[PDB]
Design a protein around this ligand. Structure first.
Ligand SMILES: OC[C@H]1O[C@@](CO)(O[C@H]2O[C@H](CO)[C@@H](O)[C@H](O)[C@H]2O)[C@@H](O)[C@@H]1O
Ligand SMILES: [Mg+2]
Length: 580
DNA sequence: CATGGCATTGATAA
DNA sequence: ATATCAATGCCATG
């Protein structure tokens, strides 16, 4: 049976109640400067559908949107907030976001539309967006009758589902996580995305020329060494040239054929000169295709800025993800790729890029959660954690720690945070399973508290069915009881890793909220641009650097209080690259 | 073709 | 041994 609603030709007073489910539909996946196809409002007075041209041109409706005393319940308010920012309209008073609520209740559900969230509470009087708009090339906004009913039904679902979702969140002790962390953060992410990051396209285009020149040289060399031309970017064809024509050893055999991954080629490097060339080709090609051509495709022609979209409701650990473009994986480890960052510049004259990062936040969180005396003392002394771990597992003094020992202790540290595994560590350090197991045993002897935590967290996940982070974010782990070893082992690693990665996520998110409040208080023009899991990137007038050097690290260091200190490093400069 | 999904690869946290 | 996003190649699918 159809749902009743008023398809209004104009805005009325009863459409402006002090509480309502609001739908400001943006069908385009990338909502930056995108069209708003329709509006729906459901309140105590009934259900209404409004045409965007009408509603958004009405002084009363716009004022209602920006009145924070007029409460709105929505789904993915960030999407509406940003689409409105591009139209010069401010959205305030959003007291409930169903997308974020569902995400906190169970990130594994993958809720991406009102229907999926509603299905969680046995409410199905609403269709999936995909069912209405279609998908892929065939997607499209349907006719008004169909469009209007869909938005009203979504608005109605939100109006109906707010209470039950809030009640469960409360049961889970996640009510504050939603209202005090995620929702406020949503507005901050909206400003960040809207502000965007300025790109020096000419710089980017020149790097593209340089890379194209080098890719040509190396590409020829490869054919010259292989005795024929082939698609180097084809693991299948490449695997034939290497393991069939050149007779190179087969150390790794992929599920579909021969492995040609970096780790394998490095081992094969000694056998033939073609290998080093393939590795180099891989590097350049990745930089060119993904970063040069990739970025240039999404930069706005007019402003020369890129506007990423931070997906706040996707990762299973509580982290954010970034898309179109992904600004959370810009090269930095290798110098050639690191150069890419020189293309990210301040949006105004005489402004500078300022970057602050937590130093070893995951291991510090581990020390806190496990309450390992040795690990807590290490951070209390602000010790080089990898040198310290080597000293312990190898039983030597700081002076006796060789570069190779630190490298291995470092690999052990990453394995501990990720959820230890002898095979996993062995694979990473290219050693035997047994030898890796010995390292791990050595590590637990030196950090008994960490061992206790790993055992306890797994048992707790088994008992409760989930694990939680410092601010009460949770992740259900049904596979923890599977009789399949591989399936269960993955769930156990997730049990060990989620509370660590997740808590580090909670902390930096709170720091973002605290920082924005401090910046406003100080009336500084500095503002957040990006977040990259453990670091915050801002831009600001050069005259604000000294104040930021003190303010940012402090706010980030005091976001939460742990059994160990939180340490934040910072750098600033003409470009992102220079902010080192 | 026609667009679409899987496989493999590699970039970030570092 | 964790969490992501996305490019190129190649076969599914019609
Ligand atoms: O608007 C972000 C928000 O929308 C979801 C779906 O509800 O993702 C959509 O938009 C993303 C940004 O363009 C795309 O990456 C994604 O493919 C599209 O479905 C949520 O996951 C997200 O939180
Ligand atoms: Mg760091």
């Amino acid at each position: 049976a159809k749902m009743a609603f008023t398809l209004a030709d104009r805005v009325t007073e009863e459409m402006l109640a002090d509480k309502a489910a609001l739908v400001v539909e943006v069908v385009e996946e990338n909502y930056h400067d995108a069209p708003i196809v329709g509006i729906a409002v459901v309140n105590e007075h009934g259900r209404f559908f409004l045409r965007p041209e009408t509603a958004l041109a009405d002084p009363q409706f716009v004022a209602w949107l920006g009145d924070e005393t007029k409460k709105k319940s929505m789904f993915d308010s960030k999407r509406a907030a940003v689409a409105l920012k591009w139209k010069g309209i401010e959205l305030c008073g959003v007291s409930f976001d169903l997308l974020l609520a569902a995400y906190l209740l169970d990130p594994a559900q993958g809720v991406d539309d009102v229907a999926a969230a509603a299905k969680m509470k046995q409410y199905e009087a609403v269709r999936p967006d995909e069912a209405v708009y279609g998908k892929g090339a065939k997607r499209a906004v349907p006719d008004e009758p169909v469009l209007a009913e869909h938005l009203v039904r979504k608005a109605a679902a939100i109006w109906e589902l707010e209470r039950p979702f809030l009640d469960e969140l409360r049961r889970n002790e996640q009510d504050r996580l939603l209202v005090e962390l995620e929702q406020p953060l949503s507005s901050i992410l909206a400003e960040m995305e809207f502000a965007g990051v300025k790109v020096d396209t000419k710089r980017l285009e020149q790097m593209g020329k340089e890379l194209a020149e080098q890719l040509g040289t190396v590409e020829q060399r490869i054919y010259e060494l292989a005795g024929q031309e082939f698609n180097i970017n084809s693991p299948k064809q490449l695997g034939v040239i290497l393991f069939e024509k050149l007779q190179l050893p087969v150390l790794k055999k992929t599920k579909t054929g021969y492995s040609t991954s970096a780790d394998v080629l490095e081992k094969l490097a000694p056998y033939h000169e073609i290998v080093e060339n393939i590795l180099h080709y891989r590097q350049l090609g990745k930089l060119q295709s993904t970063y040069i051509e990739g970025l240039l495709k999404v930069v706005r022609p007019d402003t020369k800025k890129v506007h990423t979209i931070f997906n706040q409701a996707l990762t299973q650990t509580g982290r954010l993800s970034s898309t179109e473009p992904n600004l959370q994986n810009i090269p930095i480890r290798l110098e050639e790729g690191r150069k890419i960052r020189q293309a990210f510049v301040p949006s105004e004259s005489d402004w500078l890029i300022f970057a602050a990062d937590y130093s070893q936040i995951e291991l510090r969180v581990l020390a806190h959660i496990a309450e390992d005396d040795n690990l807590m003392e290490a951070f209390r002394r602000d010790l080089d954690i990898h040198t310290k771990t080597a000293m312990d597992i190898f039983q030597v003094s700081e002076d006796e720690v060789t570069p190779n020992m630190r490298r291995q202790a470092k690999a052990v540290n990453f394995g501990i945070v990720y959820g230890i595994s002898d095979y996993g560590l062995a694979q990473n350090l290219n050693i035997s399973r047994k030898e890796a197991a010995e390292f791990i045993e050595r590590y637990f002897e030196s950090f008994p508290g960490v061992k206790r935590y790993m055992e306890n967290i797994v048992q707790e996940a088994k008992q409760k069915g989930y694990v939680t982070t410092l601010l009460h974010r949770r992740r259900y782990l049904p596979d923890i009881t599977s009789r399949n070893f591989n399936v269960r082992s993955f769930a156990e690693r997730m049990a060990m890793n989620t509370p660590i990665q997740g808590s580090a996520a909670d902390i930096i998110k709170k720091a973002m909220i605290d920082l924005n409040a401090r910046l406003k208080e100080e009336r500084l023009q500095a503002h957040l641009l990006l977040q990259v899991h453990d670091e915050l990137i801002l831009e600001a007038p050069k005259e604000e650097m000294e104040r930021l050097c003190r303010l940012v690290p402090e706010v980030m260091e005091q976001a939460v209080t742990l059994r160990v200190p939180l340490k934040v490093d910072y750098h600033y400069g003409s470009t992102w690259y220079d902010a080192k």
